[model samples]
Target: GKTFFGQPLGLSTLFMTEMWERFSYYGMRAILLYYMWFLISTGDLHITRATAASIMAIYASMVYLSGTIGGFVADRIIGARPAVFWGGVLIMLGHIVLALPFGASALFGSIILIIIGTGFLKPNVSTLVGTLYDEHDRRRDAGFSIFVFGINLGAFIAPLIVGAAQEAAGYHVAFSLAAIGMFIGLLVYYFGGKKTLDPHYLRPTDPLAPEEVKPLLVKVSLAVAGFIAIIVVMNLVGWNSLPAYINLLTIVAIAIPVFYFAWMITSTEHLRVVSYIPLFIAAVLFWAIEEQGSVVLATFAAERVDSSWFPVSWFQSLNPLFIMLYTPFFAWLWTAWKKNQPSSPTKFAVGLMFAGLSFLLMAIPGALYGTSGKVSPLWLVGSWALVILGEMLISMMSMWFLSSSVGSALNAQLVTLYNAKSEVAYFSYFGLGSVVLGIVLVFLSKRI
Candidate 1:
């Protein structure tokens, strides 16, 4: 399509920043639960398997939650500069806390803080570069392609450095290195904040009219309250069917959107109404695996993958690993395909079914790794390499899909009709999909 000369400088800066940020994240993640559950001892708190998983989920979920808030706040108070810099400080502090000789209460506190900081820094920094480009600009794709590469560069190093070091040395030293990476990222953002960051994107003078925001805020608040009330009643009654307070939120997530679509169709017309079921299924399928990076995939690397052949941390590096290798080829394919006008919905279906097929390719060994007492990393690495082609097909095209919704106001409404708004909605869809797949994998593992 369009060409740009000499790698974009903006791309380089943001790429370096995200790479290190991911380095810190995956590095720490490579061994967090190992430190918590094994090294820390079950003596004082008497940590059980379920409690450890629950704690890890909260740690992982908070990173996503804080990212949401950071995006919101970056739009208003801080912008990406301060938010990212502050996040680095918080992360460094959390790691230092972990480095301390001992204590359960302090460990919990540090984990929460690190997760919160990750949320703040993660998404907002990306938004900065996004604002730098004008709509339909030529360099934007190249910029993101470079940017994704940076993240993987960091990830590729992390598991080897974090996983291998932790495997050989200990958790404290691995965690300390994670803190150092965050500190470096923080310093990069701090000095370069005004100088290097995209100068164009800034807040609007007055901001959105309160009339519009108030109604949305009130609606979200009411939805949360209603769900909380129901959960309280369910827990109070004889329903231990759900896991815990956090797990119940996952169910409420699915229910809310189901009700939202139900309400929308009642008020709206025929075409969207008829198309709703497929749209719903598509949205569920897209995220079910996407969110697995932190949830199922992380656990899979730690528990299932016979990581003895390679570094356990290498699994954390896979996304970036694939992104780097495939981005150029995918970029070419995207350009070649640009002349043809395929609708977003079709692209969405194709992308995720590829993902499903990938799971089918790897799921059996990936699942049985634990039962067999160890499995091969090549199973995951090979499957992921192919699956990445699917991500480039699906994930990279998100903006392409959203752009198609722009023909008119009515057309815009038609795009992403099955969209979700809450963490619970997104993740439960992920878990249910994973569990369903996990069940099948478990079954197939038996046969294999």
Candidate 2:
């Protein structure tokens, strides 16, 4: 059942899958704003903060929604193996479409395909992983950890690859590289599932619970209704942020279940769910600030910083790199300090305090340059260092810290198998944080 590593060789399947999938997704991610902000036709569109944020939110929302859909398809129709294989195919096609470049149609179409295809592949493949191991298997965690390392390894390299490609070959070519990475991911899954998931693995599972389904059916129905509503809005409204509005709608549709789950899951729904209101508030503000690292930070840095200083988009790498290293150190510190009851609110305060302090450092470049138009590179780099520390406290954990938050140990291990950590994450990205933040303000707004 196990190999020389004392782990299922199928575990290697999950690692490679995660690695290549992250590489593909991150390659595109690293260059996304470089394309959007880069003046596609003219490379000089006046995309403001509201517009940029909306776009990021839209794309992110699609990824998450698609995953939910993917999970359903895997369970009911194609099963995990075929769903993953075809999902990779669609992702690759999306990347190829994105690689076409320089047209609004190209940009929007490819993105939509990627989101749709993701729905096919995203949710279910990980569920397949549990099928690989029996309960109480000790290798599960180590296997998942290995898969996690693969995800990081892909993330660490993909931005560098695409960022350098953006500078060298142009954004289209960078996207093509991302497509190729998806191909690699698909190949790994194809072969691995062929070897491990067939034959002896045939155990008929029990039917899903009715309650497991009632919410899901409602969710899917809401999503389909949403799909139709967006099409109607497009025909009627003709607004540019149609995509963004759809994103906002998706959040609401999904939020119904989320709030229900929050109240439903907890025995003490009053205190816990009520207390969660603050987290919703905190999430929005934290993301409004932290997600800045992706859009605002990336854009401003590219415009302001000198190339001689550092690779522009690779500034993201700094965040991930720091999280990959610093998480363990801080985790240990938290454990040692756990005796003192550090209320979540206190931690949130410290986190925001550090974020404000980071802004002080970031503003230095603007101050140094002013109307001269060129800022000190250290301004942004130094800010990243500060933000990375704050991130070590919060945003970093949201992305990289995927233990109990995602699913079970075995299921978590399977999720690792999809080559997904980075790509799957950015979809749900900040909305979850926003929900928490908004709820907290509800009472204050009521009180005020």
Candidate 3:
């Protein structure tokens, strides 16, 4: 079969799939902060800024957290291709829901649908990518690199489109455009995917037995119903307050992972999984720190920076742009320094240090200029530059390390485990810990 850009033919299908998915995802995210914080007259939720940041952080965490469920659905239930298609459908519907002015119901419904949809889409799509090449395929790495480029390219352009739409029309129009992006992706997959995707990958890697199917489906259905019930009860009881929901989500985030780990350790009996404990913990910390760039940094851009010159949403584009440009340098540096490169742990420590410094840099502008008025955009630019460097070194590496540490068969689960939440914890302990770890790295640098 012919290639798209010298990789497997199937990559073109996946490349465009992820590209438009990110476009939809990031396009919504670009204006999410303003949508949450601006007044009802301005066509927003009118939530407090702190609450908006908290909601955004929790939302981002859920995006990663749900990948595990998505993976499970792909591996055991529907198969990756169908999972992706269904996920795309849910995501498109979610954006459509958000485009309507249905008040809090629309917001909450959109959030739930998108989280569920992304869970089905994100990890399964990547899982499908792996099925494209054999273990010994030399083109595999290049294919992945190109796929990543597509993802970043989508993310880079999304804010530009969304930001313009937000200024010209309104957040609803931007969200409608986001829905259209996913619609385009679905069209791509429908036309091109079946032709290019290897038949071998169309089915699940770990299909369930016939006997197990009914029981699992019942359980899944009950779980979904139960979740909807909880949402309805919360809305009815007026427990829909941001603090109340955020606190509940915090509890769920910690509890789910803690319980999963306990089950994995006691019963699953994969000692190989035990070796990943340290890396997993480190990942929790790193992700918490890096993810703040979305929640906290977005708020900072809107509140503290001079957005009169540049739309605040456009700040979201900078990180992806930087990553796309600097990725080559980091890739080259890693290869060039392969022999003498620091251990994963040591590099991770540096990652935390740099991430901590990014936040530390953020605090400075407010500290120096006072938090009441706008400051130069340079502060945000510099902060993003630092954190993204750390992201390349640590965030990206942690993902690679988790997958690499385990066999390909267990990769989906391992990646899911690594996606565990840290933002709420970062808002408390790890935010402090991030700064302390930088000093810890300095002292331990030579010894390690």
Candidate 4:
């Protein structure tokens, strides 16, 4: 087997699979908000902007939150390889559903499928990638860097291609492209993975005992029954609105991280509680700002930016684009200054400063001019650049489950306020809040 970048040949397989998976995911997301709100005349959903934004936020939250379940399945039942393969299959089917013309039903169905699919696939794929190299291998970091590059590369190109397809053909056609992308990813994983991936991945890392399986099934059944009861009760009480769903999801999302932290602190004796809490708070605030790119910023691009020359979805490409450009520079800087480089907490504090500034910068154009007309697209470019810089700094230090789930849950609320309140107030309040938090973290960094 031939190697990729002097690493295992399997790295190439994982890289391509992840790249195409992201292609499908980001491509669908690029246009999903518009499909829900702006394309009403075309028989799409007639939701308000706030509701659509909230839905998008919650959807993103669920994708991450579902990872906990996905991880459990891989670790306890199916192992990572089969979980990833099945996940890819489900993702492709989800996109196919969206490619149909069934409107709201198709939309919700596709969301559920993709959420579960990504939950199964996203975490497990990375786990398999880790198996390609030993823990102490010098090439491990570089291999991962290449794998991440594939992620951003797919994300970068997807919006460009998919957005163009939507502009030229229509929404379903664009969605078809996403489906096709996932199908290609599945092909790569199925064929290439068989030759390159380790066979040991077929077995679960921590298989459940025979006795444990029955009780686990009972618990899962109970949870499902409890959920159904809650929904039935809500329907009877007239609380079955979309916003009500969002509110319930918000509580679950926030509670999960809180419970995880509490459990970790109580169960572990050697954990550094003091250092972790401050950094965890910083990570949450940082992700809250960063993850808004697809929800709040996408809306801004659609409504405010001058998109007469380009489709608004192209703005989604900027996130991955910035990551690709900055990765090497950040890598070199950290390596060259290894001993002198700022500690993780210090880097996180600085990252938060940039994240806060990105939003605060967005507030300025609205403050100076007005919210009525389109402003320069440069504002978005500048904002993305700032936030991506912050992402580079703090992302590695952050816990994905806590940061992403909680951040997106917060975003569900933020988007509602963004739609309801003035733009200046929305941006300034959140922006300044993050900056003040960063300043406080600077003082706490030494302890961390």
Residue 348 alpha-carbon offset, candidate 1, angstroms = 2.9
User: How much is 352 displaced in model 1, in angstroms?
Assistant: 2.8
Q: Superpose all Cα atoms of candidate 2 onto the true structure and report the RMSD in Å to 1 decimal.
A: 8.9
Give the Å shift of residue 266 in candidate 3: 11
**Across residues 223-313, which tens digit of lDDT does each residue of candidate 3 receive?**
7898778878989988987667666656566566457568776335476556455555555666665566666667667766777966788
Q: Please state the error at residue 145 of candidate 3 in Å.
A: 1.5
Best candidate, lDDT = 4
lDDT of each: 0.59, 0.60, 0.73, 0.87
Q: Rank by lDDT, descending?
A: 4, 3, 2, 1
Q: Which is superior by lDDT, 1 or 3? A: 3
**What is the number of residue pairs that collide in model 1?**
3
Residue 127 shift from truth in candidate 3, angstroms: 1.5
Give candidate 1 misplaced runs (Cα > 4 Å).
Answer: 1-8, 39-45, 54-58, 198-243, 252-283, 290-310, 338-342, 362-370, 396-448
Q: Give the winner by lDDT: 1 or 4.
A: 4
Q: Model 2 over residues 1-448: C-alpha lDDT tens digits?
A: 6572566777677677767877887777777866776654464555543454446545654565457556556555456667777778888998999787454557677888787776666554555655656788876655555556677788888898888887888878888999999898888888776787653322223335666778877887997998778667866866535444544454453454466556465355555556554444443355345555666566666665666644687877766676678766775787788797465564554554455555555544444445246666666666666656765665312222121122111121222221112222321233233334434444443241
Please, what are the lDDT tens digits per residue for candidate 1 over residues 112-145? 7787787667777777667657787787766766
How many times do residue backbones clash in model 3?
0
**Model 3, C-alpha of 167: deviation from truth (Å):** 0.3
C-alpha RMSD of each candidate structure in angstroms: 9.6, 8.9, 6.5, 2.1
- Among these predictions, the greatest TM-score belongs to 4
